[model samples]
Target chain A: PPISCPENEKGEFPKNLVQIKSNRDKETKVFYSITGQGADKPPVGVFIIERETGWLKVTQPLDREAIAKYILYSHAVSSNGEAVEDPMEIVITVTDQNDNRPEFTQEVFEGSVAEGAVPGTSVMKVSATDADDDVNTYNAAIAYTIVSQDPELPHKNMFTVNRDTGVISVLTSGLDRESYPTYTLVVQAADLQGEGLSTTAKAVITVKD
Target chain B: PPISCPENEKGEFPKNLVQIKSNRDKETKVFYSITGQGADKPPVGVFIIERETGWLKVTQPLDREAIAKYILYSHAVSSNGEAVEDPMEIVITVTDQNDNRPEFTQEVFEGSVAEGAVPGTSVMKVSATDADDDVNTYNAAIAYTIVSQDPELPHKNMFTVNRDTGVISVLTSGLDRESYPTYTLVVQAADLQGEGLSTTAKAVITVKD
Candidate 1:
């Protein structure tokens, strides 16, 4: 009792057409949905989107310093749990996808490290870059963290950050660059799987004797 | 009838100093004057400032697209024609100095000329690039044309362009890539002297044997 292909002479009955698929869904597995809104917050993988066929792909590949803002909606449901009647709502604008490279927009980067250098002394090196796109995995695998230092130098974690090549040098040689001339460290560039759509940038190094 | 200077306290009154030298009044020479504003016909220029040594320069050097929009307005005058009682106006925006280049956004690049092709026949190379940084020379001189042809397959000026290397060859020898297979040209990149800030980009070439 459910099959009528044509009716126009006043019999009324024409709404019922759904075809979701922005790229692949003949059941190849890998189904996920989350349209707009910073799902779970902190840019928790915005827009998700990947329903193939009719087009809408970005199941995860956009990080403007971590979801600056989001808004996109177009859903469907009816396998028995019925409720279909949405036709418009798509504003997923997260732009600025430079992927958070070039950090240290300033939080403390007072340069100068080189004096009597002993204790794994190779001071001065806190880099960062991830303009998203190239070098696989979150575009520009970058990871480094020193977060806070300068208590009297010495065991300040000895200084390390090469999570995948951000190179913040030195590990422990008693580095006494002339009584700790300068070393206000605090570097961070998570996103080699640090996830949050991955985004963080900071750097500051100084230790001269 | 009372104007002296020596820090005349209690009712200060000593205003009217002098020092003019702009080739001796090239229009009431230096006493203070700067003008620019356009739309009621504003693309103007007038400079002669040196009052009490505030020092502002740019007597002349502006081409804002040959004078249509770059926004300008810098008026301040007072040489006795008295009107500088606080007449201030400065908003000279013209920052885009590459001057113009990278044309060929298309105008006639229709191709074809293989009849017997000889005589230095190179074909095409019309290039352009200038955003005003010094040697961009009016956006890189470019010029080539053949608006029309096919007089029983005439040389049609043989086609030549290199006004500072826009490169577009073939200068003679009855081409007939099948009786003038196809060739329609109309390339340009104005701004050789920037009198009108010159601007034009076009290309359409299609030649195959």
Candidate 2:
């Protein structure tokens, strides 16, 4: 019963995970049972089997971020209520899915910049982590964006954020402390090339005279 | 932030598991975080917390057999990360509950008896084993009973069994091989004084000529 199944992106239910075939004759009539996580034990209801067909199916969509793999034992019994074979291990791996949103390391970020600073001056870097595989794939690739600014002082686009580096820099140099002493910005991060699930964080920038 | 909590036997979900109160003043904004199993890693979704209140809760039922306990580290950080507290351990233990049925040592039993044998003559013994704790009262105390008998030749009550000893013996002396060659009986074992879970086994008896 040791088998691997790739996750389907359509979020299909009752997907076939594996099929267990007994070595005995087909006419013998065998019963199937499962144990361990995702079976009869904790984290249950994920995997189930048909007693007569020996067909094992996943009852719901699986999230790799929650549990990456499952180890279970399958038992085969004859119609006479006798075990036909020893319990065998069934290893099921949950393939990575773009189901997790990027999370910021900190709830709020702080940075200080002097007034009249030159353009491209780095204010701060806002970083977020994705829980999926970080193999340079779309499922794990994250992009950063400045979602909003509290006050459109001097100009609406006073600060710029690097999409790949997550670095916030001064776009224009009219950063006068008297005009706007403090600036609030919302930063957003998303996985799957910025097309998947996303999360947001707050940034506060103080202008030093 | 270190906290230890015991699990409920009912396996209820969405229950308040524990609350981590920081020593910081209520006016100071703080963010809570957790790492390890039941956090952002594997076995996720078991534990979650309200970031603002530091109230942690279990979202689903727990089984001690699948996972006995969980070890996680909790942390509290200020909005700017300038005032971060030391990480503390959070241990969550899942209490055991009587959820398993008694299992017979063998699926089928075989025995023989001479025709016209004396009453109370021991024919055979059927035993079962339970996984639950046997010393902690009736949670694991197993009781045996004869559910049914087949053939019932001469009389339907040819054999009797000791409920506690699981020993079966002759009840009458009219055992004739010519009239009835064999008898099939079903024995059942139940835990918790036959009030909890149960399982059955088959026994075959041959009448010697």
lDDT (Cα atoms) of all candidates against the true structure: 0.43, 0.77
Error of 1 at B103 (Å): 1.5
Task: Write candidate 2's Cα lDDT for B135-209 as tens digits.
Answer: 423546789988898976777899998988899999988888898988999999987666556789999999997
lDDT by residue (B71-125, candidate 1, tens digit) is 3232344466644435344433332222244455444444444556786777766
The 10-residue segment of model 2 chain A with minimum total lDDT is: A1-10
DockQ score of the complex predicted as candidate 1: 0.01
**TM-score of each model, in listed order:** 0.23, 0.45
What digit string (tens of lDDT, one per residue) describes model 1 on residues A3-117? 1111111112222212243322342433334454544344454324443333343434444444433554555433344324353354443323212343433454445556545
* Tens digits of lDDT, candidate 2, A111-155: 889896899899899999988756413556789999998788887
Each prediction's fraction of true contacts recovered: 0.00, 0.00
Model 2 CA deviation exceeding 4 Å by range: A1-13, A26-29, A80-82, A135-137, B1-209
lDDT value, candidate 2, whole model: 0.77
Task: Write down the TM-score of model 2's second chain.
Answer: 0.77
Task: Give me the displacement of residue A122 in model 2, in angstroms.
Answer: 1.8
Which ten residues in a row are the worst by lDDT in model 2 chain B? B1-10
